[PDB]
Amino acid sequence: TFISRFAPDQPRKGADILVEALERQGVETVFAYPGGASMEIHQALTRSSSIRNVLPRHEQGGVFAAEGYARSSGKPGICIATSGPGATNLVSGLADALLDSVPLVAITGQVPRRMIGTDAFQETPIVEVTRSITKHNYLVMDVEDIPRIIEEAFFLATSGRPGPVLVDVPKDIQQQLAIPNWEQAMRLPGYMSRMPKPPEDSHLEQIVRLISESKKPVLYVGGGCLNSSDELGRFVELTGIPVASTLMGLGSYPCDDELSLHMLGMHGTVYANYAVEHSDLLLAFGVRFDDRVTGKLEAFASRAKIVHIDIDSAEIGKNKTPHVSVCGDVKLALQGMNKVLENRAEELKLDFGVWRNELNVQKQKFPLSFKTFGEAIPPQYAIKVLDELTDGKAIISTGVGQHQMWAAQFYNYKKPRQWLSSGGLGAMGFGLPAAIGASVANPDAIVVDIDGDGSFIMNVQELATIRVENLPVKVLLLNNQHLGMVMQLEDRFYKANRAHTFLGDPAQEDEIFPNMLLFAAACGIPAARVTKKADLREAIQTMLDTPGPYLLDVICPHQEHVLPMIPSGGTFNDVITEGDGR
Template identity: 30%
Template sequence: MRAIEVGLRFLLQQGVKYVFGIPAGSINAIYDALMDIPELKPIVAKHENSSGYMAGSYTRITGIPSLCVASSGPGATNLVTPAANAWKQKLPVIFITGSVPSTKLGKGGAQELYAEPIFASITKMSRTVLDPHKLPEILAEAYHTAISGVPGPVHLAIPIDIQMTDIGDRELPVLPAVQQPVMDLAAVEAAAQRIKDAGSRGAILLGNGAKAASDSIVQFAETLGWGVATTPRGKGAFPENHPLSLGGYGLSANPKASDYLNGGNHEVLLIIGSSLGELATSNWEPRLVAGRELIHIDYDHSELGKCYETHYPVHGEIKLVIAELLDQLSEDGQEDESAVSDILTGLAEAAAGSEQGEEKWNTRSAIRSLSAAAPKDTRFFLDIGEFMTYSIQNLLIESGQAFDIDINFGGMGSGLGGVIGAQLAEPSRPTICITGDGCFFMHGLEVLTAKEYQLPILFVVINNARLGMVYHGHMLQYKRCLDDFSQERVSIAGIARSLGLRHAEITSLDQLQSEQVKEWLSSGGPVVVEVIVDGNEIPPMGERVKFLQGATY
């Protein structure tokens, strides 16, 4: 049996289901081996960059490590961006790149590249495999490295002759046990006592890591009566129609969340599953932490105390930590039901008072209309651009819905690839990708990938005929910008038509109602909806501009 086939059968044994990538000469042995392993399904993308985002989102949603492959040379360098994104998001994606034959290394073979050091800084392990008999064990080591401790991506460069070498009948490698983070019970007890002492004078900020424990966090917040805000990536960890919801904090913050968290009405801030970076904290806003004590819960010990002094750092699996905190709070039984009721009522009244009246047609009103029209179990997958600022602020993510955005690394077009992985992860869930014309021009042909695999994704493309976030950022920061940031409007619906895709062109709110959205999602394949707007309104991105201005003086 060829070495690469043994390795692929090992990955299949671990639960890997898909091979994301694009076939090419130096990895042809992988795709040939898939002919004999029908349980491993190839997903052939239109660009290696997109295939990496597909793998990452599939892994994030299912918890199952993904395999993403690319050729040597340009294929490998095209995977650097999604590998960095997986590194940023702590996703156990296995990246395999091909290489020229091991006997020809350094002799100028076509597409030759020494990829190992290129991936070294953005993976937990990057290695070149030069012994075919060791390939299965090295792949098992890479897999174990990816899922152990704090998860993260790994990379192997495998020359084509190493892949193809017959190594005979081999037993598949056996993985050692994976050690899970050990909960610091003393730290949990100290945090629980501080929470009890704070009474009603506390607030909660949720990051993406909190999503794994969202149900218990709702119970936890209701027990305390504390207001709950979410970071941009944490959006969806707490239902935004809940009376305790403050909405989003950080980039494109809900004013209610900013006023509450930056105000002086609480003495304890409980942070769950956030790295507290620029976009999560409104450019590290000092008022967020001024005059209060921080309790920070995270499964990655390195995040605790990294950005702010943390008085009560708690390391452990977030779901288990929240369960332990709930046990300790219920044992105490000191909940002040009248205080909790007052807070719930006050926040509900504030939410009701913030409702907007009828709006004119623009990006914000289009996002709000889409939010209201979407099914109650929709997964929204956001791309990167001006439209995301409106989406973070105006998509109302309710219980049962989900929200994804690869915002920390922030690659344009990441949503167009990522949403395909998301739909494969949850095939029965309504899935809507919100993207922009700039992202579409980068990776829009992935809608054809969705067509080829019959994925019923609704692609909503906000077309303002410009790089909107760049345009408005320059106008806010420099009061001028190059004409090159805008272009003559191109019909994206027309592009979809030429690809044989269902499509629609939207220019008013009455075209973006629940009956249309339901019909698009039930079509059995992808639908491209072009939303045509002027895009002249200033998006809610002021904190991002402040950060960039800091680099000018």
């Protein structure tokens, strides 16, 4: 029973209705940056005793913070901006939240309704702009539609395949007085009628049946299983099938397990790709068959009966036609298939040890390797130190690049929603703000941003947010003085011809530039720079033990390459297993 700060018959500003609409949705943290077209909302936010605002230093940081808030908690992330330039600074976060299916609700202020379409001051058609990069969006044309639109926005952003929903609110609506009707029925008939139903035992038993007829099965787990953590583990006990995870599904099934194949795909392990390439049953649970995972579709799992479970009926048969398909929640499919596998325990000769010991051969012949030159810090080793020193129980956000792949390969995430990384859109500068949101959603957790010198500087202004809000965000900066991932593609396919990939100062090429420590200093954040591999363990330990924020500039040799690598559009018979720019 909600307790409003206003009488049920007392007229209140539309902005006070909007904030109360968030309170009734369980919202307790928003990332709002004020502006003229949204001051009424910001005023109403201060009147709320249950909603906290984390003021960012850039709206792109605000939306990415709402993402990290959402990815690390399963709750929807809420960011607020003003009209015009404030709204356009959310675009990257919206497109990023859509491609990775992150529950997000963005509220932008808008010019008064009479001004819309007149090219007014700070007036951009943010609805017309974001329609293709949002799950849905709204334009509030009357103050009485606020309670319904907010309820539809949160429902749409969190139900089914989650995504971002934008709600444009004109300024006059925020100022208008009304008595909100909190029991309007959501005008979503066509959406709920197509919401997936619990899976039929007809399909579920044919899958269990296909598991027993199979001899080389592989699990293809992705971002759809982030809530099916326990159900996936219990399903693996009853079958013993190896688990190849995607960059989004990392943590669903523990990486430190002997049945885990870690990540598959372009920069996935040689053995996980092998298991898929020579399998007869592919259990694709909560994946979207990305080109970063399949490459050439005709060659992807070209000997396997593909069983695809997905809550989005559009993704089923989108890029690869499966044998069996189940439109629905993969959580329920596992629950149903687990009951079928217990009551048929002794009836099913379930033992794939012949298949697993074939993989464990490839597992120990082509494992994740890294060279260690002299005392230069290998970035892969630095992350493996962070894994050990944090017991693998630390929330990890990343930017985009080599340091993003090494953060995925060389860290053993034990639970989902511990790994926050931009996968679909792959947006640099995601790490630092996502660490801000995750730290606010999980105040008593170790939150570490494994950023790169390129991605880190893009939203470096959010260091002020970390200090002001007093958040224990640890920044493990893998400084290679380059845009390494673009540099690696230059070494491989363009004869190492550098085309604007060096981020330091060419006048003093042997000086680390910029001095990231002074960035932390400007925002009153303790910092340190480690250079020799011997000092690396003590440095990371200091970063963890030092309370509050901390930036650790970890210098790395820039010629390192992320391995293995399947060239885009290739097959498993092209996986590059060694090589770097030396």
